[PDB]
Amino acid sequence: MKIAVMTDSTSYLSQDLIDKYNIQIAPLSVTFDDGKNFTESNEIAIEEFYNKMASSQTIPTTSQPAIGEWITKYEMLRDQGYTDIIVICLSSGISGSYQSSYQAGEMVEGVNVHAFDSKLAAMIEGCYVLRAIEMVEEGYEPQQIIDDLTNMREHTGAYLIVDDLKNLQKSGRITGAQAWVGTLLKMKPVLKFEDGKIIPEEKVRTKKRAIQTLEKKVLDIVKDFEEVTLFVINGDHFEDGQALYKKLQDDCPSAYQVAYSEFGPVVAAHLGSGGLGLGYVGRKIRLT
Ligand SMILES: CCCCCCCCCCCCCCCC(=O)O
Numbered sequence: 374m375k376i377a378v379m380t381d382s383t384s385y386l387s388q389d390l391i392d393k394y395n396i397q398i399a400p401l402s403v404t405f406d407d408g409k410n411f412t413e414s415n416e417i418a419i420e421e422f423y424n425k426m427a428s429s430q431t432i433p434t435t436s437q438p439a440i441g442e443w444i445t446k447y448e449m450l451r452d453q454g455y456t457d458i459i460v461i462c463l464s465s466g467i468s469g470s471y472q473s474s475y476q477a478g479e480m481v482e483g484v485n486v487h488a489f490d491s492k493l494a495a496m497i498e499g500c501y502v503l504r505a506i507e508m509v510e511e512g513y514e515p516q517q518i519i520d521d522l523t524n525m526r527e528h529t530g531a532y533l534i535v536d537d538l539k540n541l542q543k544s545g546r547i548t549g550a551q552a553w554v555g556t557l558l559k560m561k562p563v564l565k566f567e568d569g570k571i572i573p574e575e576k577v578r579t580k581k582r583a584i585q586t587l588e589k590k591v592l593d594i595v596k597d598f599e600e601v602t603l604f605v606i607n608g609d610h611f612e613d614g615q616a617l618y619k620k621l622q623d624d625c626p627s628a629y630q631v632a633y634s635e636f637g638p639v640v641a642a643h644l645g646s647g648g649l650g651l652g653y654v655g656r657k658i659r660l661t
Pocket of ligand 1: 401435436437467468469470494495497531532533546604605606639640643644650651652653
């Protein structure tokens with residue numbers, strides 16, 4: 374038995390980890406209203422994506438990995454000698470990437486594919502990749518890994534804010550918000566993931582209080598966990614995520630793992646400007 378672990382590009386793992394563990398990536402892409410197509414990777418500067426999105430008369434659209442892209446990656450790993458492939462996918466509630474990796478795994482010959490629906494995104498999704506790799510090193514078998522990740526998913530989540538719901542509304546990736554649309558006010562929505570989908574949680578008066586609300590909601594949850602990893606995932610307003618990251622390092626005990634990451638182009642296209650998430654995993658994920 375020889376187990377590989379791969380993922381899609383929305384796991385947003387650092388290039389250091391991708392290089393170290395030779396993590397294969399099925400890339401998602403963004404298409405701008407001028408017809409320019411960009412596949413996600415770590416070489417394109419995220420600041421230039423936000424600049425182009427801001428200069429777009431029409432919101433850019435995104436594409437999941439084609440089923441052929443999953444198949445090609447599966448065949449490449451199989452031909453390297455891997456007998457089993459664990460695949461960590463973007464939430465099935467917001468993208469068809471998972472079901473396409475699942476169906477691609479049915480179609481590829483000569484290798485066993487174990488597709489996993491992370492029901493989240495960004496480095497929180499990436500944490501499932503890092504847990505699977507760690508377990509492969511420890512000699513666990515594919516079903517044992519899938520079982521462990523499924524348990525991990527029960528104590529994993531995220532809350533988030535965005536400047537403007539228009540991007541999420543345009544793509545249909547905000548669930549059950551046909552009420553705070555258009556109207557709202559200077560008030561700020563706080564959203565959360567729930568069974569793979571993005572739903573409203575609370576409406577607060579200011580953005581400053583929304584960021585305080587992110588921390589309170591998450592700390593209230595993880596105080597009951599035996600292990601805790603927290604991820605501040607920042608959008609285009611650098612000072613928002615850096616301030617929350619710094620504050621969490623101060624307010625939390627060192628027994629909490631507190632890490633930082635950012636949104637890539639595909640997720641940023643759906644969030645728009647001002648995205649800021651606070652995610653948690655009830656595990657001590659190996660980040661090295
Ligand atoms: C702290 C963690 C926060 C995570 C927030 C992630 C927000 C995701 C918003 C929707 C993204 C949808 C991508 C769809 C890609 C496609 O299939 O075209």
